[PDB]
């Protein structure tokens, strides 16, 4: 029995998400102190995100960008940082290196987009912008989504300095020094990734699909906030608890 009716049952919390707060922001912070913003309980339009041509290293892994509007996700964890112009290959699952291992690590089962633009007018001063920062020397390989905000002095060879910088003692947090005379491998990249999760929580945040009023016991093709299937909707006596 083919479905003779397709119904849409997205929730109607019609207030929009603050992607303008996330994307159009003055101060994206550094890769050692990348900012997390929780996006929930709103309608999120990703068509203006994909249709904007300012991005050049988009590369959404696991979810295709055109078919992204019609599912509904549990949570958006908007991470945002500024890196060098050759380290977006480090911002990917599987790849290891300086930015990937010692600054920000993605999960191996990562599902999300790697949205970034190239900003040379904004984040480069003639002379060098010196508080955009990155960590080289660290005695711990980071598990994904970790915070290394500590400014402890690193000891390498034998004797611990423990509070001073000197022989075999390097400070971990060193500046980029972004100048506009640099090439495209040294230009600032403002990388803002959107980590999602499919099945861990209630599905909340998604696109502007217009909901359709429900119909009864004829076999229909339903869309209940991201799960698509064909079947018969019938009244039930199953005591669903509110979680």
């Amino acid at each position: 029995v083919q479905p003779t009716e397709s119904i849409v049952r997205f929730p109607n919390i019609t207030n929009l998400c603050p992607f303008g707060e996330v994307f159009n922001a003055t101060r994206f912070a550094s890769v050692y102190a990348w900012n997390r913003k929780r996006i929930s309980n709103c309608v999120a339009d990703y068509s203006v995100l994909y249709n904007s041509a300012s991005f050049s290293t988009f590369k959404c892994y696991g979810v295709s960008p055109t078919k992204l509007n019609d599912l509904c996700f549990t949570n958006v964890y908007a991470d945002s940082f500024v890196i060098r112009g050759d380290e977006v290959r480090q911002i990917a699952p599987g790849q290891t290196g300086n930015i990937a291992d010692y600054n920000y690590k993605l999960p191996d089962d990562f599902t999300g987009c790697v949205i970034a633009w190239n900003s040379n007018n904004l984040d480069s001063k003639v002379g060098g912008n010196y508080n955009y920062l990155y960590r080289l020397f660290r005695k711990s390989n980071l598990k994904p989504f970790e915070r290394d905000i500590s400014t402890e002095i690193y000891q390498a060879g034998s004797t611990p300095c423990n509070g001073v910088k000197g022989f075999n003692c390097y400070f971990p947090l060193q500046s980029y020094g972004f100048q506009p005379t640099y090439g495209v491998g040294y230009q600032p990249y403002r990388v803002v990734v959107l980590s999602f999760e499919l099945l861990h929580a209630p599905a909340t945040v998604c696109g502007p699909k217009k909901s359709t009023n429900l119909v009864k016991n004829k076999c229909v093709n339903f869309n209940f906030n991201g799960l698509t299937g064909t079947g018969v909707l019938t009244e039930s006596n199953k005591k669903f608890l509110p979680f």
Partner: antibody
Amino acid sequence: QVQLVQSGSELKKPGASVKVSCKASGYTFTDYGMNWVRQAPGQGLEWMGWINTYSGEPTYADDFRGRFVFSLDTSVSTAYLQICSLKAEDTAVYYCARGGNWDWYFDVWGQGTLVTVS
Amino acid sequence: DIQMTQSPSSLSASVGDRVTITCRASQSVSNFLHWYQQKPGKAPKLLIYYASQSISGVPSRFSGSGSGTDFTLTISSLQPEDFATYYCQQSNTWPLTFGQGTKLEIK
């Protein structure tokens, strides 16, 4: 002395194209950006855009995206705005601002070209 | 895009009193406000940057404070020669959006 000398009062037809000036002296022109603002007489400050002082790309605000062009000339410290195809709703005074890439607090200082349109 | 309203629009004040005026933003601007004046026929002058700190070289008859979206400044000693329309300036999200202005009036 740090000051931003601004051109005189313009008065033209709704459809002409003029070019006001913002000439600066005293500070490092390369270090800071070159913000701009308008004054409707029954309203307040309204921003249009910043200009990087090494290349001069004309990025604007989200409202005034159209016929408005900023043109910076390097090594002479001139920061020309060119307004083209003026309308009757552009009876505003256009101050000039020093607004950097990092700081974004103004200390705005301009004499104000009294652009009256009729 | 930050729809900033500020209240009250036109308020009266007296000599040597203490008045409190507020500037409110719709979205989160959590610690970024800059405060201006507008005398007629005069370019604006900055007082308070990043909503707590004051600029060097201003007469300190005032202070600014606040967190979240509820921001204010308080005149601790008012003088009649100011009568300036107070302007608030956000610096978090583009575009740089200003306020309408609280005009100070003497009786």
